[PDB]
RNA sequence: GAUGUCGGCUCAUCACAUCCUGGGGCUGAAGUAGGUCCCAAGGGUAUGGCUGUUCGCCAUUUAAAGUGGUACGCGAGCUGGGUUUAGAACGUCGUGAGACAGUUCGGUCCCUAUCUGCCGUGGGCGCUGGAGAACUGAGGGGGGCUGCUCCUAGUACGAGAGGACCGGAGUGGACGCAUCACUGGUGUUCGGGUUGUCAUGCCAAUGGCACUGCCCGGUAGCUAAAUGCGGAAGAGAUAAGUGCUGAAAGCAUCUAAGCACGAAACUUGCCCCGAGAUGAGUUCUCCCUGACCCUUUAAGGGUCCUGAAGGAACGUUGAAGACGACGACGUUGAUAGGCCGGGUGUGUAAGCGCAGCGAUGCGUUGAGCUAACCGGUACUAAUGAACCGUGAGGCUUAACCU
RNA sequence: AAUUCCUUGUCGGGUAAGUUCCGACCUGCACGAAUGGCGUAAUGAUGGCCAGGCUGUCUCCACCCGAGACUCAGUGAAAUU
RNA sequence: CACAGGUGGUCAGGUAGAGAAUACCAAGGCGCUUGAGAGAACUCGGGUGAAGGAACUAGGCAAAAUGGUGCCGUAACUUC
RNA sequence: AGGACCGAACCGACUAAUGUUGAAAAAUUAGCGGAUGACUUGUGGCUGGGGGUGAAAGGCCAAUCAAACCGGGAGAUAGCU
């Protein structure tokens, strides 16, 4: 349940480590974002020579939340905490070329399969 | 709203509806019948009926849950001792409500809430 | 509630083994991996039951790469294939939701060995 | 906010329509005591369905 | 098609093959014998009037428990009526069961909302809250401005403001018919149907895709 | 002899000079995408940074972020930041008191709703003898939004780059309703831990008070973040528009006669209310089958006897509820409480025994206790009765029947 | 700038975005030396601005405990007209 | 006004406490001169809140938060 | 040692909510400032109306002070309603 100021951890190499949630894409008003909506976001904290810098303006895929996935049998998914992951502002891919963390199969998708594949384990 | 809530206010807050109700229980198991507002009454009920239902068997714990129930010595005896096996055999429903009048004062519809088996004798001393 | 009661059993699994909270269980559960119908395995400490016969749920935290990951099994639920106890925990409460903010070496379970 | 026409004695009259009592029906008498009480109530003497239930 | 007059008894749930939890409400659908049947010739209309379960032989009134007579049929909880098809004919006394829903892919629900009493715009019309601080002055849950000004000087109708909410007659629309078993008087369907644990629904068949 | 000012908030309502979606003519319209105009008001029409700002700039969305009216809508609805009081300062002006339509810091927002209006909800009477149901549907309200992807098709089109119409499937956003099975929140009435202190003689157990003392969990219920469902398809008559046949006017011409089409607008269709629809409708069932007196003799008044169906009362009550109303039951009875069994929740009570110097541990013991819950049970309470409502119901005419 | 009208001056900083803030420039409408100038540690229920923590301030409300509001009995006002 | 206001000096029990704070008590003194029901909106006053954490707002107003003793340790600047 | 620090009594009154026909003609509740000093307080005394007193706000001088209250000139005058 990801909104606007809601801060996430990075789940890639992209050099980011705290990025903000500016804007929740995907329709007039929209309210939140969920595992697997994409977010425009703001990076808050960044490593020294990363692929991105402090400031950069870009968007992301949430891949782990706390409120997390439900499943046709009522199985619930609960992660620690809310990570997202970069994406090219217009190609919509990802820039890392390393996943970190666990992922969900709600991932899997044509335009979020290098995610999938690249992740350390999926539920 | 209300849906499907059990129990009354009574224009009391949690402390004190408890304390009424264990001193009002008190007053019933001693004389054994005493008049009063038919909501407190009706709500004593679900308060004396089951203090019998332990009354009916004589333990250690029982006597001290009771004890905690009533904190009066004087009711738990009077329990264990005589109510429990004076309502031995009957299966709940120790009590009975006759509807009095009206209070003045106030117009609160009264009643009168009394041991299905009432001794007249011990009610007196 | 009684026409409820006589189509929730005729639903309900016999086979569901005895564990409790603290306990550490290995739930093998259904999975369609792409174009492939496995079992996979989830392994964790089990924070919580819901007791509520074809309704019975519990949780079960485990700390994959780091993070805390919980999972709520709906018990009767044919996804869930086994469910097995890999260690008898030690606890006294029935909900370890405390365990949240303990990690590793604080978050460990004492052996119910009895 | 108050009023900016005083209301009559008709208005009065109309507000009240609703106002009148009703006379209580439910007056019994009981077959031992021969006395008047409410239904469903012990009379002034402790009787109720014609048992001395209250000695008062 | 016709309708059947049920019970709710309740929600619960359905663990498919493909595990999967469909979420039911158990419909209770005894007998629906036929107490009249109107006729364009008589009444004007193509319809059929029906009763289910059982009434309180002291609790039946003289005019009822004739109307009942005439058919030939027991006293029910009441009476509801179905409008016919061209071609739909039945006859008085005829029981209708839930096996008519046998085939029939989705159904309307028609129930009566449980009762929320009296409910603020808030709860009622979904109204939002003003400033709970700020200098805000009794007024967290108030309507706000109910109008204008001397243009127009009165407030419209139809104004949403506070009233009574829920226990009113309301229609959930294509729920999916989940189980039909006639021996054990059942319907299950997908989803919530309006109103609490043993009021009366109507079941009938979806008007709608 | 007072019509409170800007802006915000809450709640709106109308216009259309239409922002989006819909229909269409031209295009300096290949496609995609634009430009322009015509029809069209059904619904829809961002969140932030900055400033009191409306506005505006900017950031990032969106199908879109419409333009106006409504005392520049809305303070007996809220705010009080802007702006006119009284304090003080700077610049400037004045010898001065003081001044600014210059800036700056601080600076009391009352009103229990009589009438109208509006949201709910009752009482009365009526609808022509009374009464219980079920309807009919005149009328009124609700609703009406749209993204993306996939198929057709990488096809038409194009030099490529790119990339469709028509039609079909899937999935979302926003909004609405209902529900509590699920995930959860709450749950001062359930269970546990614990701090200080006081009490039950004391130990042991417990209870009171300290925000439920502080906390950990949690039943029923209520509930959103939870999970179902909805917008429609269809029909009719059209708008701008496109046409067929066709004179006036040998030709031409959508039009004058005749004819075919044509939109989220309109009427239906879907949802709710709905016969006080006084134009008071229909259908089915039920109930009542005594005399007398008086006068101004008539739809007259009164008396005796009668008291039906039904309604109501009173009681036990309800996932119904401010009250009223509405539903369930009242002994030929599960309506409420109690009681029994189960569930659930809490997490191994008390007491005793063993181990240890002890705090404490272990066994008995998944113990003990367990609200609103499920399945049962007449044990307590729902008493024989009263009251309102009557006694066959107007005239005229027609059609039958005498 | 408690002083600047033009004016949200310009530049740099901070933010995704900053009519406020900080640094700088000087074109000071209309700074300036006890009508004191310009600094300054400490002090301040003083004014502006930023960050961590924190949360019902907000997204967007939910549920619960109390006192009213509602019903019964007793007493019994007011502005206004 | 039998009015939540105002009014100088004296006394200082127990356990916990740094204390005349505060919490529970003693002696002593009181339950405040309308009650009974009910458990709607709304207002006051409190308790808890999934995910988010200033996005609120003129302004973090208001909340929430911090909070004790001992020891370690503590930057610019400075009138030391 | 100190117009030193933290903090009850005591003296103040910065914020919010309530209250605004109030419990109250200025309060209550939660937070706030001072708390060995230019501190605070009891009793009694002096200063009187163009007068007092004022760490200065035209503050205060017996519930409305850019000139108190009472009585008088007095039926001031009112081209005003
Ligand atoms: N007291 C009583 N019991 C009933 N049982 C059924 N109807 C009634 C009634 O009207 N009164
Ligand atoms: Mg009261
Ligand atoms: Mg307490
Ligand atoms: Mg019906
Ligand atoms: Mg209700
Ligand atoms: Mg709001
Ligand atoms: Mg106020
Ligand atoms: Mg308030
Ligand atoms: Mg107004
Ligand atoms: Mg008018
Ligand atoms: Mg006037
Ligand atoms: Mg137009
Ligand atoms: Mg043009
Ligand atoms: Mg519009
Ligand atoms: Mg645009
Ligand atoms: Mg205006
Ligand atoms: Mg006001
Ligand atoms: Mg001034
Ligand atoms: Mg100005
Ligand atoms: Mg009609
Ligand atoms: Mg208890
Ligand atoms: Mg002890
Ligand atoms: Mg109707
Ligand atoms: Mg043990
Ligand atoms: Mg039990
Ligand atoms: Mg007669
Ligand atoms: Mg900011
Ligand atoms: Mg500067
Ligand atoms: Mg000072
Ligand atoms: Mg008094
Ligand atoms: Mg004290
Ligand atoms: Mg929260
Ligand atoms: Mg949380
Ligand atoms: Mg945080
Ligand atoms: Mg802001
Ligand atoms: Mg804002
Ligand atoms: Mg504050
Ligand atoms: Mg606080
Ligand atoms: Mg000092
Ligand atoms: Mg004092
Ligand atoms: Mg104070
Ligand atoms: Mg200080
Ligand atoms: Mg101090
Ligand atoms: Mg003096
Ligand atoms: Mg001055
Ligand atoms: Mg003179
Ligand atoms: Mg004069």
Known sequence: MIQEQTMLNVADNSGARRVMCIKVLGGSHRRYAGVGDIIKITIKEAIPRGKVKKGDVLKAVVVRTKKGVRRPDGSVIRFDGNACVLLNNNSEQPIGTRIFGPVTRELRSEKFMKIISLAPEVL | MRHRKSGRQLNRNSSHRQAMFRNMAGSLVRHEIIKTTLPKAKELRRVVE??????????????????????????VAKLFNELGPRFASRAGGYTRILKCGFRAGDNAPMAYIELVDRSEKAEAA | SNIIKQLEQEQMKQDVPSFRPGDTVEVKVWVVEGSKKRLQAFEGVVIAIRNRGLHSAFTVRKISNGEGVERVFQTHSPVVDSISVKRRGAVRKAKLYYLRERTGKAARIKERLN | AVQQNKP??????????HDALTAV??????????????????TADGYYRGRKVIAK | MIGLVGKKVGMTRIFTEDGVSIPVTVIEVEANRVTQVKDLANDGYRAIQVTTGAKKANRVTKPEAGHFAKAGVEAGRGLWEFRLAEGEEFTVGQSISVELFADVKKVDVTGTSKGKGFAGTVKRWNFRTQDATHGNSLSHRVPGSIGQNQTPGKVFKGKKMAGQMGNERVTVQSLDVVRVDAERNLLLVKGAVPGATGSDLIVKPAVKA
Do not use: Q
């Open chain 2, 50 to 75: 089951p203090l019998i239902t332990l009354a009916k068997t004589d333990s250690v714990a029982n006597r001290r849950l009771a004890f905690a129930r009533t904190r009066d010595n004087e009711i």
């Open chain 4, 8 to 17: 009559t004695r008709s208005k009065r009259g109309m507000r009240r329509s």
């Open chain 4, 25 to 42: 029906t439910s007056l019994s008498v009981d077959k031992t005591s021969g006395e008047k009480h409410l239904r469903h109530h012990i």
